[PDB]
Amino acid sequence: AAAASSST
Amino acid sequence: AAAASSST
Amino acid sequence: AAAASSST
Amino acid sequence: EACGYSDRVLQLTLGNSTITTQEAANSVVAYGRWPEYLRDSEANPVDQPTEPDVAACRFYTLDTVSWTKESRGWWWKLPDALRDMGLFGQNMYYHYLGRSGYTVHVQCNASKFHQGALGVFAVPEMCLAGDSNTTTMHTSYQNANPGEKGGTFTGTFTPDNNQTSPARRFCPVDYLLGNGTLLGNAFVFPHQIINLRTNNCATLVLPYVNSLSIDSMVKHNNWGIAILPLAPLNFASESSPEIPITLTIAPMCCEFNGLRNITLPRLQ
Amino acid sequence: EACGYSDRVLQLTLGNSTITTQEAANSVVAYGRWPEYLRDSEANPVDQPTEPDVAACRFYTLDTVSWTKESRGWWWKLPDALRDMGLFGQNMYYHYLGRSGYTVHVQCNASKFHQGALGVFAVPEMCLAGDSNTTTMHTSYQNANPGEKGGTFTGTFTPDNNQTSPARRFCPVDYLLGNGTLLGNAFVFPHQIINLRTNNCATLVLPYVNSLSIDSMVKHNNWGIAILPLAPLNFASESSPEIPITLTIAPMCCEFNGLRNITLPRLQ
Amino acid sequence: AATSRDALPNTEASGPTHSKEIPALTAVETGATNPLVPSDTVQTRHVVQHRSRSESSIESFFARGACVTIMTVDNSASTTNKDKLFAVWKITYKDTVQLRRKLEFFTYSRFDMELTFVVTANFTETNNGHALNQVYQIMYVPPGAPVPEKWDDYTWQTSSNPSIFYTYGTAPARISVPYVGISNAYSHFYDGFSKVPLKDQSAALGDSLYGAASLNDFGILAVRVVNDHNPTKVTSKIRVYLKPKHIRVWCPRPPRAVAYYGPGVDYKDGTLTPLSTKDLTTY
Amino acid sequence: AATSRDALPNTEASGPTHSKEIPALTAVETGATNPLVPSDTVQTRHVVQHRSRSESSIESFFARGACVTIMTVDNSASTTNKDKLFAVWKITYKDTVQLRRKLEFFTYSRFDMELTFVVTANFTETNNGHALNQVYQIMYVPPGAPVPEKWDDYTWQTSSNPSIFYTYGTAPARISVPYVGISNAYSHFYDGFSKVPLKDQSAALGDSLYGAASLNDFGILAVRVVNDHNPTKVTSKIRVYLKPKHIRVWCPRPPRAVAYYGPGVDYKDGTLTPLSTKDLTTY
Amino acid sequence: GAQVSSQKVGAHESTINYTTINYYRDSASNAASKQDFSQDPSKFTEPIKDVLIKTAPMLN
Amino acid sequence: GAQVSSQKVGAHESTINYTTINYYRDSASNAASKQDFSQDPSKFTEPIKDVLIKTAPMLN
Numbered sequence A, B, C: 001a002a003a004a005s006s007s008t
Numbered sequence D, E: 001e002a003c004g005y006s007d008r009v010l011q012l013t014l015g016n017s018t019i020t021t022q023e024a025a026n027s028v029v030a031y032g033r034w035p036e037y038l039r040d041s042e043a044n045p046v047d048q049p050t051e052p053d054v055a056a057c058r059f060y061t062l063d064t065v066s067w068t069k070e071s072r073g074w075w076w077k078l079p080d081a082l083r084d085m086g087l088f089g090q091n092m093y094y095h096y097l098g099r100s101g102y103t104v105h106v107q108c109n110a111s112k113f114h115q116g117a118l119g120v121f122a123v124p125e126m127c128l129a130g131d132s133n134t135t136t137m138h139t140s141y142q143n144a145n146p147g148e149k150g151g152t153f154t155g156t157f158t159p160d161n162n163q164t165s166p167a168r169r170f171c172p173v174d175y176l177l178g179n180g181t182l183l184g185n186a187f188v189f190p191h192q193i194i195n196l197r198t199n200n201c202a203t204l205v206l207p208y209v210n211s212l213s214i215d216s217m218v219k220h221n222n223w224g225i226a227i228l229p230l231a232p233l234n235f236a237s238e239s240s241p242e243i244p245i246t247l248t249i250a251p252m253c254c255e256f257n258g259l260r261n262i263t264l265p266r267l268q
Numbered sequence F, G: 001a002a003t004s005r006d007a008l009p010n011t012e013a014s015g016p017t018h019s020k021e022i023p024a025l026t027a028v029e030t031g032a033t034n035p036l037v038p039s040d041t042v043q044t045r046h047v048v049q050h051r052s053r054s055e056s057s058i059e060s061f062f063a064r065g066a067c068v069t070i071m072t073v074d075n076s077a078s079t080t081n082k083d084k085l086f087a088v089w090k091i092t093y094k095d096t097v098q099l100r101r102k103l104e105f106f107t108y109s110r111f112d113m114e115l116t117f118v119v120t121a122n123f124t125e126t127n128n129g130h131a132l133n134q135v136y137q138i139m140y141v142p143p144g145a146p147v148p149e150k151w152d153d154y155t156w157q158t159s160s161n162p163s164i165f166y167t168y169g170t171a172p173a174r175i176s177v178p179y180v181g182i183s184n185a186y187s188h189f190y191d192g193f194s195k196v197p198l199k200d201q202s203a204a205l206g207d208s209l210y211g212a213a214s215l216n217d218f219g220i221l222a223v224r225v226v227n228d229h230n231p232t233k234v235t236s237k238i239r240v241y242l243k244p245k246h247i248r249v250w251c252p253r254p255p256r257a258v259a260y261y262g263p264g265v266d267y268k269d270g271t272l273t274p275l276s277t278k279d280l281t282t283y
Numbered sequence H, I: 001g002a003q004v005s006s007q008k009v010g011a012h013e014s015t016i017n018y019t020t021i022n023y024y025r026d027s028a029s030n031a032a033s034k035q036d037f038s039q040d041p042s043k044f045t046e047p048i049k050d051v052l053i054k055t056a057p058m059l060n
């Protein structure tokens, strides 16, 4: 998951 | 999750 | 998550 | 075996009874399961079971029947055919519940100049068809349980018509295994063939089979033994040949639950 | 064999054909040589050979003949007897040269109450004697090659006399193996005996034999199969008993050289 | 470890034979079937086998909803001689023949059950009136519970019985049921009676149907139209589809060869000649 | 590694030439096509190419539901001479022409199939009566299974055949089907017969249709209205849309140039002049 | 609690997977997994006390 | 079991992705991925036994 979920 | 989600 | 998702 | 031993020659011993055969075609163990006692994990009635052992688990020989050119076949039900057999029958009627496996040994010898082939079938839950076309599932308990003498197949369905006072009995047509299915497929059931040029006996070891761990032996038959002439008796040139068939059966690993007074069934 | 196996019971499989026998007297391999393909050291025609394999190296059954109290014997030649047999015959006629070995299986069953003994002989270069006393080496190609139906021995030399238009055929007297030598000595040739109390078949494995590595199959027969009644057929008390003899033969390791148009032989 | 969808065994190449091993000869009297493969009696080539038995597994064989009954109800005005029609059905797989035949390839079975309900309605008269959308109530009445006598009596309260309230025109209704048997498996066949006729006691009392176990196995389904009746009459039908999921089966039987005649194995006269003419030497 | 959506090759700059290399001259007799690019015969500038062949891949070319048939059913009262109408359709892509033409650009194909069903109904008479919402049953009857003879006979039980129960007014129905061929690919064309006429045997027996393989390829679809009939008559139509997913194709063919005439390659008289007048030296 | 398994791929357009989640407490509510095992027919095809060798005589 | 891939972005408002999950066991139920490969036309455009060099004489 870490990568996948990109966040802004 | 890491594995699972395969990505392309 | 690791455990959780069991895979077969 | 270089030191002598063979498939065709067997000795079976259970209790005070021994059977020998010099012309067997091996033995069959139904569904590959040998008879056994009820396991604790599968147990249901909580009382200490009665286990008759050698007193009941021995070979009982039933009445010899006779095979001829007109025979269409014979049937028996278990435990019913053994209901009057010594201490097995007694333990059976004194208890509410009971379970048993069986060694079935069918005996039929003839000569190198006779021919014919008997199909011996062990059928789980062998429900047979009745004689009525105006009402179903109506064969009476007395008619359904012939005891040791068994019943027979017919080549023709002939419907009981006395509506006022019905026969209330089975009408088992041979090519339909008495149950509406074709005889040619009865080989999916545990079986052996007594082909007179090859062997003179059939031996089947039958496990207890049911959807329950233990049940009422008086109300319910677990197995049906059906014997049908796959190929008709024939000898030299005699138009009326005859040869005997003897049935010997042994209860195996049998146990009983729920002791009380004896059940005295109305069998006539 | 303690686990069952025996000399008398064989299964032979070649191509899409299987033979079983429960009453054999072993098998014979002629001169102890199993059929084989032509080796490079012994090769002669330089072209790439045709090797039909399963298409031609299978069991062909010829016409069943009948053994009686008056039978004097039968003969066949190879490859001639197989000239019309499926893809073997076709490969044979399309090529100038060819070589083959054979498994010969002679079949003759009867009963524990019959008696008689057939001598089965495989003769290399089985040149037979003609019917003429006024000219020699004159049997015609058509008369010499009966094809699958074979020919027969006679107990009496009876000379063709129509000098104007001669029979031009063989006249093979049985006690002289049709070739001027005594039948009692034909046992120096690869053979088996079908003695009705002992066995019901004869099996011979024949290598390619010749003074050449490969030759014309249409012009030349490598082997003769001779079957003669060493001891006459007899049964119970019937004055006219009869029993069938069936010949089944399989080409083995066969190969052909020199391809062209098909040979259309005048066989009548 | 072999799974239903694994590929079947490869054919192996095999050549000529001349020996004492006799695969082809056997003796069926023994009760066994000769386990032969083509390379035993003919010369075979090598073939890498891809086919699998995936679709003929027991689950895959029964993984279909099958119609077991059609129930008719309506919504008319209850009047002194005729009442608004609600329906009652004794749950069984034997009212129709197709799934019954499939289950009866076996003596005993175990499974969870999936019931799907298809509901269709129509106008019974050459009227012109209308009807607003109907809601149906499907109540499960297990053996012992009060069976409804009227489309609107107290039993339809369902305080403890499971009920489905289905709205017309929505996706067909569906529920699941566990293995509910009082035995360790369901018995497709029962060779016996539920009563021992006792000498000492009168015959009429000792009696019971052959092959029948509990008079009321699994209870009944009771269906009604919840709506009060319209002036116009609407009839509705409820088709029930049954699917055995997570199924296990024991002791194989020959399939039914002649027409079913009742809930038992009985066969009726004139239905007993299934096979047709075909001569011994005619391809 | 090149994907359908990668950009096409860049044009490279090229200058004047005076040499023995002769790109322009070739010989088509060889069976080959001259692999020339503009820089071979003219002076080109450099261009970074962005265009891709993404939409003309085989999947992308066929990724559309196409109408393959229209089925008519109704819901009227079955009466001594005329019966309630159910429909039967032999599954094929050749009853219509558009998708047929697209598939026939190729000799063989392999694909999973997606079938979508659009259902429309209307009133056939200048009545005034009504009809409650209809449920349709779409049953797949594979070759060998009992084909229905009546809108309501036993076959509609579907114990083993797959059926879809569609409610009118809901989203169009849809299912998927695997590659079900008894061959390793579907044959759009079959140059042969399903029968060898044998001399020895009579001609009438040896005979069969040219280009036809199994008489019944994929079986049929049977559609019915589950509802009992209303007094008022309603006719319904079921349009079937077919989409090849996960498709592979082999051996390209010239497209059909003249009107289809039957399930084969046959052409009918008077339809054979497709091209139109246009003079040699007229732009 | 998601369960991931692989599809035995029929006609192709690495391994492909699908995902399952059980929404209900009762196992009777669960769909059928179709992940089933095969067994060998012996108990029906060869129910004989003495093991059979197919190349040897069934009767000896 | 989710599968993440990137969209080839046409008209813009980093790489953008989309997510796929297969709900069914049968691969026939799966949508089309459209992640397809191209091949070169050689087998149709140049099916000749001897490799062709475009600058040299096709026939020599």
Ligand SMILES: CCCCCCCCCCCCC/C=C\[C@H](O)[C@H](N)CO
Binding pocket: F091, F092, F093, F113, F115, F138, F139, F140, F162, F163, F164, F175, F177, F180, F185, F186, F187, F188, F189, F217, F218
């Ligand atoms: C709101 C809907 C609830 C529906 C509840 C249904 C519960 C009852 C399930 C019925 C079980 C029937 C199984 C079939 C029959 C038995 O196999 C045979 N008679 C043998 O025992």
Ligand SMILES: CCCCCCCCCCCCC/C=C\[C@H](O)[C@H](N)CO
Binding pocket: G091, G092, G093, G113, G115, G138, G139, G140, G162, G163, G164, G175, G177, G180, G185, G186, G187, G188, G189, G217, G218
């Ligand atoms: C409940 C709906 C089930 C629908 C089931 C449909 C299964 C049958 C699929 C039809 C396959 C047709 C493929 C097209 C035709 C063949 O390509 C050509 N005749 C060449 O072989």
Ligand SMILES: *C(=O)CCCCCCCCCCCCC
Binding pocket: C004, C005, H001, H002, H021, H022, H023, H024
């Ligand atoms: C294991 O299940 C942990 C991961 C959960 C993933 C999201 C589940 C999707 C919504 C499920 C709600 C369950 C409904 C009863």
Ligand SMILES: *C(=O)CCCCCCCCCCCCC
Binding pocket: B004, B005, C005, H002, H004, H018, H019, H020, H021, I001, I002, I021, I022, I023, I024
């Ligand atoms: C791999 O799939 C692990 C992550 C699961 C993410 C939530 C899935 C959303 C609900 C899927 C249920 C599947 C329905 C058959």
